[PDB]
């Protein structure tokens, strides 16, 4: 029933501007109040502030002034939020809520990702990832596929274009100077590496990149 | 302009026993909120005004508490309740978050399994060479990573990132990378992994040769 609706990912520059939206469903939107959330990686849910149409009530953190501007649209439906400032501080996940009245919050938002970055988008690598010269020890051989130096997030990472799901551990990115480093590992038996066709596929759809790597013996 | 500090940070808990988190404020607190968020996923509410429960919320979570401290009871723990808790005040504007109570699964204890890889050529071409060692299926999460180049450690360029626990196994997975130039690569030979883990003292050791 009641859903909010928000985009994906934002990222703009140090320094300017960006107006977040939130499409609200399922409920009479001028009815109960909307509230704002931004969570960072490890620091906590940390609460912005939150606007009633009705009788329009709007409430701030005093530590998000002026860095938030809180508006809304009836027509259309939607929930603004324009942050001023934008710094590295910023990059975090900012949350829609809504909740009747002050001050807890009952359905949650999809969460738009902010990231505040000089960088510019880069298309990604993809580099195969062999086992040492001979043989693996034990029965089960393990290979990977690494993929260094893309910005921005995410990459789709599947093997054998979808043939091989189970036994695949996919590694989560890190920022390392403006472009990201990923990789992921598979476990197979060795009666099936390299008598069969394995594969890694990584696509980004930001620079519309679409790379396969065969994993050749060393 | 309360504080609130949830206790303890990290919870380890096995599936079909009592589990107790508690919450704990600066000053006197009328009502009390909870928030649970399921990795990859939308917080949601809970528990509210301390004892209540919202809509959707399985019969098995339940509240209590007064003044500073609160307190979130699981009577039973189950696999799908393994996620982070929020704590969540008013009367007081802010209207501030907890910490976040991380409810973790229970596992027997797991030995990991490492998998050293040497630079891929595509990458030497450039002028890079990443060294990219696998720590898969252990548990519990904390474990100790050690880079050795011919004997001697190595600190800088270092890259760790952890997976969340697993839905099927309950275990974690860890993924090491040192970032070297080709010059520095190609000036020494032996390039060593190793893995300092809470199920052995012993560390678990994966190496290779640049030479061979």
């Known amino acids: 029933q009641v859903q909010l609706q928000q985009p994906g990912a934002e990222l703009v520059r140090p320094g300017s501007s960006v107006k977040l939206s939130c499409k609200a469903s399922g409920y009479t939107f001028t009815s109960k109040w909307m509230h704002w959330v931004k969570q960072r990686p490890i620091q906590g849910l940390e609460w912005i502030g939150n606007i009633d149409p009705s009788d329009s009530e709007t409430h701030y953190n005093q530590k998000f002034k002026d860095k938030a501007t809180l508006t809304v649209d009836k027509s259309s439906s939607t929930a603004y939020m324009q942050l001023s400032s934008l710094t590295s501080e910023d990059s975090a996940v900012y949350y829609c809520a809504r909740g009747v009245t002050r001050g807890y919050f009952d359905v949650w938002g999809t969460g738009t990702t902010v990231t505040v970055s000089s960088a510019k988008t880069t298309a990604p690598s993809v580099y195969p990832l062999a086992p040492v010269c001979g043989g693996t020890t034990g029965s089960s051989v393990t290979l990977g596929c690494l993929v260094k130096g893309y910005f921005p997030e995410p990459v789709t990472l599947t093997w054998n274009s979808g043939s091989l799901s189970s036994g695949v551990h996919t590694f989560p990115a890190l920022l390392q100077s403006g472009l990201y480093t990923l990789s992921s590992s598979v476990t197979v038996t060795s009666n099936t590496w390299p008598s069969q066709t394995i594969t890694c596929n990584v696509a980004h759809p930001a620079s519309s990149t679409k790379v396969d790597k065969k994993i050749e013996p060393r | 302009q309360i504080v609130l500090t949830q206790s303890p940070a990290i919870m380890s808990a096995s599936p079909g026993e009592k589990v107790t988190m508690t919450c704990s404020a600066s000053?006197?607190?009328?009502?009390m909120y909870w928030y649970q968020q399921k990795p990859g996923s939308s917080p949601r509410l809970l528990i509210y005004?301390?004892?209540n429960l919202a809509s959707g919320v399985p019969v098995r979570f339940s509240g209590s508490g007064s003044g500073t401290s609160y307190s979130l009871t699981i009577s039973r723990m189950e696999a799908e309740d393994a996620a982070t808790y929020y704590c969540?005040?008013?009367?007081?504007?802010?209207?501030?978050f907890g910490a976040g109570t991380k409810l973790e699964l229970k596992r027997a204890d797991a030995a990991p399994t490492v998998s050293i890889f040497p630079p891929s050529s595509e990458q030497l071409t450039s002028g890079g060479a990443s060294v990219v060692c696998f720590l898969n299926n252990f548990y519990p999460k904390d474990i100790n990573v050690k880079w050795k180049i011919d004997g001697s450690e190595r600190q800088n360029g270092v890259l760790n990132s952890w997976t969340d626990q697993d839905s099927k196994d309950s275990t974690y997975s860890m993924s090491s990378t040192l970032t070297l130039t080709k010059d520095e690569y190609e000036r020494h030979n032996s390039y060593t992994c190793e893995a300092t883990h809470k199920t052995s003292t012993s560390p678990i050791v994966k190496s290779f040769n640049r030479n061979e």
């Open positions: 000053s006197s607190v009328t009502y």
């Open positions: 969540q005040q008013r009367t007081n504007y802010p209207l501030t």
């Open positions: 005004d301390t004892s």
